[PDB]
């Protein structure tokens, strides 16, 4: 209940709450039904609509109007947008050449240039250049400010998880909203779009950035817009607080457009129809540039154009039917559409089973338009898991389709012609990122990037210490003039041992058997001391991060970080030239494992492990295809170089070491790469401590991976060789899943050459990704600036078109 005949005046859009049940006049009202009896006389006045027309220049103030064209409007903050253009002879902003803001020309008691956030629901990336002719105001911000080709959302790319993203920079994941729709279990509690649950503070983790302004002493205008508040008023709105009194004045703000999402689900992403929403968008920017130019704040402002996600062509025909690969499809609750997410319906039923399910949906027809996942199978890069609001079963569906439970979900809800919410590298889902200010560079193209790297960048140009997010600070610093986050390296926590030769051979009882001049005996000697070492590290070692004790060893052929504590490498670097050569295993070789005489018997792995564990089998991280020589090859059989590998991932694993390396050395021009495990157990994203491994070997102390990784480094000109770079690197980067079958690849009873490449394209990871999940630190010697090497390690090579 609230005591709705208090009154708005001198309140409209107040910044700050009052407390049912007095009544509100901010702009959340109308959604908790609490408005004044007079808000929408007092605050949303419509009278003679948006625009100075010549005869009402220097009109008496009318107190009526929706704007004014008064002589004293200016000062009162309440100009019509046009009114300069009108009744001044002054030009529109979007006529005006583009000029260089080399430093920020603001009003006197302006402490800081404002930051204003312009967010477009549905705004694909493609519309920049396929919309050009109708948005001239965007093309303008775009081409004279900074901008980049895309902008990679969050998943789902849905539009509450990409713009509290964009607000507080943590994956969905670590911020709670998950989906468009979700419920949570420990709340018997459904949020959706609809309704007022929404509204609930307990759905919204984080800090976003209004929070972060509002605790470091910075106010904000406000994030959430009334959807009957026309956008003429929302701008006005923003114009007005900009010239409230320095105490008062806002420095940041944010401005909503529904559109042009809302007509792209109608009519699809490049419908007849979608011409006119993009004009009208446009013309709200005009008018929000003319009113800032009016204000003089045109060259003191920061602005960034920004898309929640973009628009695909779907529609009800395309629809996969769980009733048509399920029997008991009534014992499930599905959230649906562009994505699945699966639970029981009541969880009084010990008789409800995954793995049952799963299998029903599991390469079940040739042309299936969707893939069931447990969600910590999802590909790493989607971050997707670590959240009790996110299903155990997940459906990725395939772009241009939908999922649903049965038909009569569709036809008692064709409706719709577009529709979002795909894996994020899909190129239909990429959005916009344009930044005009003082604060942003001149003219300048960056490449894409993704949107949770944005709330660090906004908090550096409003001088606000960043809440920890899942941004790299320092990977967007090239997007601006000034304001630039000075990154460091963390310090190393963990200094390597170097061991030399300390055991002898009958020293080992593991179990294991191999078949096994002067001039080159000093020879191996120094590639055992890493004479080599230059050639196959060539970005210096990686830097362990937290405390454990491990042994730094030297290889004619590769390099790698010895873990004590989890007997197998962290890390084993090579280089592979682009003049390498592609050897076999020898017959006699097939099952030789080697003690390292540098390695303790009691901090080695052993075959009869491998002999007893049935289902478990291994593989080895520098791989015996590329050595150099037959004598070296001796070297890539070392017990230190053995890792527990399944049998069907052990198809994989081949396939990349014996064909896939050598082909992208020949095409990258020589490669360097790092190989290793990973251990998430609590799909966290984190890297596992020991006591969280939940499966070893079994009868051993050897842990079993989750994922095996890959960084695959070459230089960017692919005219100089990987090893002897000038300038700047180029990296594709994977976090394969360690599993026990291939029922993920619909096609693997086929040769390796028809399935293996695609898996690992879909398992495709950012180098910061691989940091998270190994505690490591790339890339700590190189010859280039630290911020290229956060951009560097922050890109991801997404194997999409253009
Ligand atoms: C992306 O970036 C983010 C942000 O940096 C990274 O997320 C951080 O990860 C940290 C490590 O996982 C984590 O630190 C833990 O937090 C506990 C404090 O938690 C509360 O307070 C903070 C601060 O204001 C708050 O942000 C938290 O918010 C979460 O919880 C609410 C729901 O209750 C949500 O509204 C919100 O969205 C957020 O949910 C997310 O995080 C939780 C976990 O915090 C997940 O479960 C959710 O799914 C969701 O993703 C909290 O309100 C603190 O208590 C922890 O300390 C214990 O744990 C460690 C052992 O790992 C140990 O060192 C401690 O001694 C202690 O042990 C004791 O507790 C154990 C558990 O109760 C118990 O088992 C033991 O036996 C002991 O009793 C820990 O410090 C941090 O909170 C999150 N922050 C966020 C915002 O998510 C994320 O890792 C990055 N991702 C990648 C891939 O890099
Ligand atoms: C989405 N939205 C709606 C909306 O969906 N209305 C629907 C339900 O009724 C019709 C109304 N106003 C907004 C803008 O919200 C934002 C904008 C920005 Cl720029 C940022 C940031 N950073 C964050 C948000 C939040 C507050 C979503 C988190
Ligand atoms: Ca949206
Ligand atoms: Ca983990
Ligand atoms: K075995
Ligand atoms: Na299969
Ligand atoms: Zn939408």
Redesign the pocket.
Same mark, same amino acid.
Request: net charge negative; glycine share 22%.
């Given at each position: 209940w609230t005591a709705t005949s208090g009154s708005c005046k001198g309140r409209c859009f107040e910044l700050q709450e009052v407390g049912p049940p007095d009544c509100r006049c901010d702009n959340l009202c109308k959604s908790y039904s609490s408005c004044c009896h007079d808000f929408d006389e007092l605050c949303l006045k419509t009278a003679r609509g948006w625009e100075c027309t010549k005869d009402r220049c220097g009109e008496v103030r009318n107190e009526e109007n929706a704007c004014h064209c008064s002589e004293d409007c200016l000062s009162r903050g309440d100009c019509c947008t046009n009114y300069q253009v009108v009744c001044k002879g002054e030009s529109h902003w979007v006529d005006d050449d583009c000029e260089e803001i080399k430093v920020p020309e603001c009003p006197a008691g302006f402490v800081r240039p404002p930051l204003i956030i312009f967010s477009v629901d549905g705004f694909r990336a493609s519309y920049m250049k396929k919309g050009s002719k109708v948005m001239p105001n965007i093309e303008k911000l775009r081409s004279c400010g900074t901008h980049a080709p895309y902008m990679r959302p969050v998943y789902p790319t849905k539009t509450f998880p990409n713009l509290y993203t964009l607000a507080t920079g943590?994956?969905p994941?670590? &911020?709670?909203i998950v989906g468009n729709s979700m419920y949570d279990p420990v709340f018997d509690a459904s949020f959706h779009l609809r309704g007022r649950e929404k509204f609930n503070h307990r759905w919204w983790? $984080?800090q976003p950035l209004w929070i972060t302004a509002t605790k470091q002493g910075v106010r904000a205008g406000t994030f959430f817009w009334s959807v009957s508040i026309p956008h003429e008023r929302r701008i006005l709105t923003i114009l007005q607080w900009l010239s409230l009194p320095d105490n008062e004045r806002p420095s940041v703000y944010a401005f909503y457009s529904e559109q042009p999402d809302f007509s792209g689900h109608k009519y699809g992403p490049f419908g007849p129809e979608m011409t006119n929403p993009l004009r009208e968008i446009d013309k709200t920017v005009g008018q929000l540039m003319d009113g800032l130019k009016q204000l003089r704040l045109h060259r003191c402002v920061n602005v960034i154009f920004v898309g929640d996600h973009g628009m695909e062509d779907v529609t009800c025909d395309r629809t996969e039917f769980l009733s048509n690969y399920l029997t008991n499809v009534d014992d499930i609750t599905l959230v649906p559409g562009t994505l699945g997410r699966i639970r029981a319906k009541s969880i009084n039923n010990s008789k409800y089973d995954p793995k049952t399910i799963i299998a029903a949906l599991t390469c079940k027809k040739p042309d299936q338009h969707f893939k069931p996942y447990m969600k910590q199978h999802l590909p790493k890069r989607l &971050?997707y898991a670590?959240?009790?609001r996110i299903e155990d079963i997940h459906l990725l569906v395939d772009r241009r389709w939908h999922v649903a439970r049965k038909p009569l979900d569709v036809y008692k809800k064709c409706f719709f012609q577009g529709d979002h919410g795909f894996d994020n590298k899909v190129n239909s889902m990429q959005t916009v990122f344009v930044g005009y200010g003082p604060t942003f560079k001149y003219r300048t193209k960056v490449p894409p990037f993704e949107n949770i790297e944005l709330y660090n960048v906004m908090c550096d140009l409003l001088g606000l210490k960043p809440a920890?997010?899942?941004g790299t600070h320092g990977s967007l610093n090239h997007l601006l003039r000034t304001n630039t986050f000075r990154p460091t390296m963390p310090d190393e926590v963990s200094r390597p041992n170097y061991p030399g030769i300390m055991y002898l051979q009958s020293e080992f009882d593991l179990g294991c058997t191999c078949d096994d001049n002067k001039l080159e005996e000093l020879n191996k000697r120094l590639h055992t001391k890493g004479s080599t070492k230059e050639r196959h590290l060539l970005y210096g070692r990686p830097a362990v991060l937290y405390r454990t004790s491990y042994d730094i060893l030297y290889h004619t052929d590769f390099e790698s970080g010895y873990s004590e504590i989890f007997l197998m490498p962290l890390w084993t670097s090579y280089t592979i030239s682009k003049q390498a050569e592609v050897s076999s295993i020898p017959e006699h070789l097939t099952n030789c494992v080697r003690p390292d005489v540098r390695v303790s018997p009691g901090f080695s792995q052993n075959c009869l492990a491998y002999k007893n564990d049935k289902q478990m089998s291994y593989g080895f991280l520098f791989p015996p295809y590329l050595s150099s020589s037959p004598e070296a090859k001796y070297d890539a059989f070392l017990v230190t170089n053995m890792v527990p590998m399944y049998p069907a991932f052990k198809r994989v694993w081949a396939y990349f070491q014996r064909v896939l390396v050598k082909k992208y050395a020949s095409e990258r021009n020589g490669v360097n790469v790092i190989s290793g495990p990973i251990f998430d157990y609590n799909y966290? $994203?984190?890297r596992d401590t020991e006591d969280e491994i939940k499966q070893y070997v079994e009868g051993s102390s050897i842990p079993v991976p989750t994922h095996y990784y890959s960084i695959i480094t070459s230089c960017l000109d692919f005219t100089q060789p990987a090893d002897k770079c000038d300038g700047p690197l180029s990296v594709s980067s994977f976090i394969l899943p360690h599993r026990p079958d291939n029922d993920e690849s619909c096609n693997s009873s086929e040769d390796e050459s028809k399935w293996v490449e695609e898996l690992m394209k879909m398992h495709t990871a950012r180098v910061r990704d691989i940091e &998270?999940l190994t505690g490591l630190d790339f890339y700590r010697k190189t010859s280039r600036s630290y911020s290229e090497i956060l951009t560097l390690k922050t890109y991801l090579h997404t194997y999409e078109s253009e």
């Open positions: 943590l994956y994941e670590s &911020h709670g983790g $984080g &971050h670590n959240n009790r920890p997010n899942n966290d $994203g984190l &998270h």
